[PDB]
């Protein structure tokens, strides 16, 4: 919303347009760097004002919310690697 100084909604159909174009990196930025990659969006702004290229993005926070909401439903959602070993996307902040 303009009143809230808000961004433009990049809905599903707009995402499909980037997928059809093949703009994998343009789509990835709008999903992570410009929306909810908290570490990515802070680094992207800092890199630009220093004259550098924006860094490689990271996992979005919305997916982190999805994992936690799925766990609250007693569903064990685990992100694995090539060798099926679990990968911690919370950076050790949720592991006891």
Partner DNA sequence: GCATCCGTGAGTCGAGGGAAGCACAATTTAACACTTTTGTCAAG
Partner DNA sequence: CTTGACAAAAGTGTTAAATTGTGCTATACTGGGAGCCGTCACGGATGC
Residues 46-85 within binding reach of DNA (CB under 7 A): none
Nearest to 53 by CA among 33, 23, 30: 33
Nearest to 12 by CA among 33, 34, 36, 30: 30
User: Is there binding between residue 20 and DNA (CB under 7 A)?
Assistant: no
C-alpha 93: how far from its chain's center? 17
Contacts to other proteins from residues 29-88, by CB under 8 A: 29-38, 41-42, 44-46, 48-51, 53-54, 57-60, 62-66, 68-82, 84-85, 87
Min separation Cβ 40 and other proteins, Å: 9
């Amino acid at each position: 919303g303009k009143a809230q100084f808000g961004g433009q909604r990049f809905g599903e159909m707009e995402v499909w347009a980037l997928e059809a174009y093949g703009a994998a990196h343009t789509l990835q930025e709008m999903l992570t760097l410009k929306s909810d990659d908290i570490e990515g969006r802070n680094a992207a702004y800092e890199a630009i004002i220093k004259g550098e290229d924006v860094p490689e993005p990271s996992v979005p926070e919305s997916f982190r919310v999805l994992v936690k909401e799925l766990q609250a439903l007693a569903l064990d959602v685990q992100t694995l690697d090539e060798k099926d070993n679990p990968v911690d996307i919370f950076e050790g902040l949720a592991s006891k």
